[PDB]
Write a protein that binds this ligand. Sequence first.
Ligand SMILES: Nc1ncnc2c1ncn2[C@@H]1O[C@H](COP(=O)(O)OP(=O)(O)O)[C@@H](O)[C@H]1O
Length: 254
Amino acid sequence: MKLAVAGKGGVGKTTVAAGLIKIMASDYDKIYAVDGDPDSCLGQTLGLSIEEAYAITPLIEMKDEIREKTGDGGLLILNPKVDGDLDKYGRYIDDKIFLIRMGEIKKGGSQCYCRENSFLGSVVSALFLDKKEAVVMDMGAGIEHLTRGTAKAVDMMIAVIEPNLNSIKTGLNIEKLAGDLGIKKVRYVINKVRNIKEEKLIKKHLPEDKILGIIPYNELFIELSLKGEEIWQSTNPAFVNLHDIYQKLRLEVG
Ligand SMILES: Nc1ncnc2c1ncn2[C@@H]1O[C@H](COP(=O)(O)OP(=O)(O)O)[C@@H](O)[C@H]1O
């Protein structure tokens, strides 16, 4: 199974991705947790300490492997090859979850251009097309990491939104981009709903079949965030919601 989780920053996109990763880590023998969003740490949210996460060097910073994979000094390999060498780009969090941190993309200007991007692209592409084990990658609303090439391999794009017009619009934006790109399934996860009014607002703009589930606002996510980190276990009343979301998710995929 290949999943993409997108959402504007602050919507709780990383928290949702981590939750799904935690829950599906028992239906698969391995899962590629891919942090495609620099602004938030999928690693820490997954339970890693700020030290263990930093140590897992970001794809964008493997300046040597980038030079070697895209040819150096002489050649230039427009199509870097990366497969068996994936497990060298991350760390196993445990016997099931392998984490890869993309690292922030750049643009610069006529200096050291396009190389590293073809590197990350190769990784993403290999993860979705060449690899067979479940993959769950989170990303911002721009879903910049996906391409028509990989889009065909994405079983589902999960748009995480909050219960308000703006955010709902962003969700719809994501649905458009994902669609244009060729992803067949785009489902929503409304996070941080605080009252019933919000739930109604949601239903008034989004169809029922397009909604995976709702996650209530909960102080726990804030407390566990900066101490326990085990923010996703029976201990959390929101886990019931994740279970529902996940179950509904597998009903549509496989
Ligand atoms: N359902 C929720 N209820 C309360 N707080 C939440 C909830 N989901 C996420 N949060 C908080 O939202 C903040 C941003 O989460 P993250 O998932 O890191 O955001 P993004 O990935 O949207 O930048 C985190 O501090 C997280 O604890």
